[PDB]
Amino acid sequence: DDFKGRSAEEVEEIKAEKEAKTQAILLEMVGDLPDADIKPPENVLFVCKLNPVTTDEDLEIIFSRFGPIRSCEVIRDWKTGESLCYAFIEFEKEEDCEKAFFKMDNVLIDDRRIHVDFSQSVA
């Protein structure tokens, strides 16, 4: 023991470590990612709640405000092309990702209060 007798906090923290390890191994089990849980780049924000009329150009516009962009990728419903009302947006700096985040969370653009969180993608 002593992976239990430390606190309650780090106890459930170890169990959350687990929950991660199991969900990862699980998602690789059902087979999505090639390499197991490689740490995600600090330089992309996943921005959902989006509009099918805001495009790569305009989103790269408004997120050109805080940092040098490397891209703006709204994933496309393939054979119809309609914007998925979310996006990935790609910065150069950690500071650029952060500075975009801490002003752009839950803001109203094109009359929709979109959400920004960092990228969870290992993709």
Binding site: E19, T22, Q23, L26, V30, E98, R113, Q120
Partner: protein
């Protein structure tokens, strides 16, 4: 026409509706306020990774859930048939084994959990229906002593298709309606009028120009049946091009040309698109069914018939209702289908009879004993009678032992448990006879193959609503000529049948009235009054009825609505009136729901509404487990009344996690519970529009009873020393035996039903304060009268 005044109003309706919803979301963006070094950043970036990780854990396992399901959902309809090749073949092996591996590498962990809580743990001092198979291995353990063909399907479909009473009648009927917009099409069941006709239309292209073909039915389950049937015919997937839309369940896609629905569903499509401009054709089935929704659609669609001649009116039904049908509908031509599979020998008693339930008994006795093979259908009036019936039948079975053969008595009605409904649908065990005891629920929409005998005692239990008393009484009623003919016609569908009328040719031909009174006369109409005044037709009198209600009935409706506050003192719409009218539920309920707004008992009043939507079947009360049943009931019995009883009951069920075995343990009809949950959830989906804030009473049932009053003040009685008697009319009522207050007998009473069974009755009753009555309705209830 008045049609044009209507659509005038209704296009402005859609305009003001959209603008209203937009205004309200602007209101909410107003009400809602949402505004938004080094080591600080390197601190929370670990915490943003904390949440990224964990929300990603749920998100990744959720996406695993998606593609997980998708592998098998994909291999359902491609693989098991076709000559498919290396790539997707190998990947089927892959996705097969791989979702197995996921389930397995999680079943491992759960195995750890359960195995390691199997163990012994010193106690610590701190101040599914198988009770008859767990008593059938008690005995076997006590008594042990050891020391292509899809094309073939299509061929079969067409081959049966060809033999309908309509397949040879195919072309000329097509050309006929090509002539006449309104064509009345009289034909009996089994003709396929519901199925083959819309096919014919579609293959003839009335769906071209992107148009649709509507088929309306009075019953959800019948619509689902019909839709399954015709989608199988059309060789496509049910839901994409052939679809059915019923309350709570869409089964359509933007490929849908053939759209099936209810009569209230079509009225509500007029709540969407007054013109039905995407529908080229509406085929209304079985219009004889006499529902308020049928009798409203008739008027509305007749308006549309005069206004939209490129549009098509098809109204098919079962019986001789074509006289009034055409006559109201400007005497449309009537295309006759001859359709009746096999014959019935219809017998009469010698005489009139005194004891017709017993006569039922002894009839089926003789029939079973003497007859050749064949299943039997017998009618009764309803529940108590019907179980008494099976009582008698199975008792005589007990006495007559092996002298007779196996008599599968099966009762069937509307509220009895759904497993017990299904049980009749199994194929009969060889050599035994199956007799179904039924109510007029077995008139229609239930298809029991094998029934070769049919017995009618010639009755029914019809509701009768007198408005002069506000009283609707579900009482005995000799059933109509149309009834007896159709009850008989229920037979024969596979072979020669017999129909034993418990009454003579004399009474039959002579004292038989043709039709049940078209519903709108006999029923209470509060919500349909509410509806046509939600559509705004201010003159409610010269409106285009098929059969108007008595001016009496309408006057009562108007007073109802005004007193409740839906009407101004001149009879038009308040914001109260409209906001309640959007609700597909009675105005009394609606007033109570609005009262939750004032009393901050939102959730509780919501769940109450959800209960009164369906109550009539809540608690199963079997004879063979009466006491344990009364007990799992008496458990919840709360102080205050039946409504908060229901509240806690639902609360505890969902508390159990929507558990079915929960209601199974606690003697509750799962059907009632779960449909009530659905009606509450869609109520909540209405709740944003009706502008209700999601609130709890915080355990304050005083607010609850008060919102109940603010809704149901009309539905009240007081103590009199000569019994419990109304507040207004001082007509004399009684309490239902099964009331949570039935022995409490309160001084100031609220009810929800008003019937007069064997004596005057009232259901879903509660104890109130007369003071809340001067709180709520000092204009309707004055003090001196309390």
């Amino acid at each position: 026409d008045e049609w044009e005044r209507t659509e005038r109003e209704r296009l402005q309706d859609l305009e003001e509706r959209d603008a209203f919803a937009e205004r309200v979301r602007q209101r909410d963006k107003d009400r809602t306020r949402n505004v938004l070094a080094e080591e600080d950043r390197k601190a929370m970036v670990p915490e943003l990774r904390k949440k990224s990780r964990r929300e990603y854990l749920a998100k990744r396992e959720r996406e695993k859930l998606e593609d997980l399901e998708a592998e098998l959902a994909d291999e359902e309809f491609l693989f098991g048939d076709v000559e498919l090749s290396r790539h997707e073949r190998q990947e089927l092996k892959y996705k097969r084994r791989v979702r197995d591996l996921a389930r397995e590498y999680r079943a491992a962990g759960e195995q750890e959990k359960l195995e390691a809580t199997n163990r012994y743990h010193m106690p610590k001092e701190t101040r599914p229906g198988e009770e008859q198979r767990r008593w059938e291995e008690a005995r076997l353990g006590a008594a042990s002593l050891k020391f292509s063909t899809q094309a073939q399907q299509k061929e079969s479909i067409q081959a049966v298709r060809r033999s309908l009473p309509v397949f040879p009648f195919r072309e000329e009927l097509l050309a006929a309606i090509a002539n006449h917009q309104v064509l009345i099409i009289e034909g009996e069941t089994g003709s396929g009028k519901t199925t083959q006709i819309p096919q014919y239309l579609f293959e003839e292209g009335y769906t071209n120009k992107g148009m649709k073909i509507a088929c309306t039915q009075p019953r959800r389950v019948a619509a689902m049946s019909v839709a399954a049937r015709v989608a199988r015919e059309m060789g496509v997937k049910l839901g994409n091009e052939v679809g059915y839309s019923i309350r709570f369940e869409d089964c359509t896609s933007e490929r849908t040309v053939l759209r099936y629905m209810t009569d209230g569903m079509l009225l509500r499509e007029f709540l969407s698109e007054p013109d039905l401009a995407s529908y080229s054709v509406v085929m209304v089935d079985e219009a004889h069914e006499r529902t308020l929704h049928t009798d409203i659609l008739f008027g509305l669609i007749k308006d549309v018939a005069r206004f939209r001649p490129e549009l098509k009116v098809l109204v098919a039904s079962a019986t001789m209702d074509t006289a009034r049908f055409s006559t109201f509908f400007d005497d449309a031509p009537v295309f006759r289908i001859p359709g009746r599979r096999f014959p019935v020998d219809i017998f009469y008693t010698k005489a009139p009879e005194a004891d017709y339930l017993e006569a039922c008994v002894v009839s089926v006795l003789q029939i079973h004993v003497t007859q050749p093979p064949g299943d039997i259908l017998v009618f009764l009036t309803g529940q108590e009678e019907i179980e008494a019936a099976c009582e008698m039948l199975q008792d005589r079975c007990r006495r007559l032992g092996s002298k007779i053969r196996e008599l599968l008595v099966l009762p069937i009605y509307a509220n009895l448990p759904s497993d017990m409904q299904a049980r009749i649908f199994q194929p009969t065990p060889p050599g035994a006879r199956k007799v179904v005891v039924a109510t007029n629920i077995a008139e229609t929409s239930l298809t029991i193959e094998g029934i070769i005998y049919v017995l009618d005692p010639g009755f029914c239990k019809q509701k009768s609503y007198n408005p002069r008393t506000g009283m609707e009484s579900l009482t005995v009623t000799p059933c109509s000529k149309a009834s007896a003919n159709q009850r008989a016609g229920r037979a024969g569908r596979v072979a020669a049948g017999k129909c034993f009328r418990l009454y003579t040719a004399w009474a039959y031909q002579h004292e038989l009235e043709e039709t049940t009174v078209p519903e709108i006369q006999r029923t209470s109409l509060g919500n349909v009054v509410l509806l046509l005044k939600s559509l705004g037709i201010h003159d409610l009198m010269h409106f285009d009825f098929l059969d108007p209600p008595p001016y009496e009935t309408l006057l009562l409706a108007l007073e109802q609505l005004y007193a409740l506050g839906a009407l101004n003192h001149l009879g038009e719409l308040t914001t109260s009136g409209r906001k309640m009218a959007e609700l597909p539920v009675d105005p009394m309920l609606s007033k109570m729901i609005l009262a939750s707004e004032k009393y901050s008992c939102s959730e509780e009043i919501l769940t109450v509404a959800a209960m009164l939507s369906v109550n009539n079947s809540i608690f199963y009360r079997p004879k063979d487990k009466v006491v344990h049943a009364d007990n799992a009931r008496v458990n919840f019995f709360l102080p205050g009344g039946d409504h908060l009883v229901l509240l806690n009951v639902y609360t505890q069920w969902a508390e159990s996690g929507y558990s079915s075995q929960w209601c199974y343990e606690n003697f509750v009809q799962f059907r009632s519970m779960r449909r009530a949950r659905d009606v509450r959830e869609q109520l909540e989906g209405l709740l944003e529009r009706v502008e209700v804030g999601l609130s709890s009473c915080q355990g304050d049932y005083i607010r609850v009873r008060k919102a109940i009053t603010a809704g149901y003040f009309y539905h009240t009685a007081r103590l009199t020393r000569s019994g419990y008697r109304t507040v207004k009319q001082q007509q004399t009522v009684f309490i239902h035996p099964n009331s949570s207050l039935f022995e409490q007998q309160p001084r100031w009473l609220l009810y929800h039903e008003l019937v007069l069974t064997t004596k005057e009755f009232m259901r879903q009753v509660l104890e109130i304060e007369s003071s809340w009555l001067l709180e709520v309705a000092p204009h309707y209830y004055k003090a001196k009268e309390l």
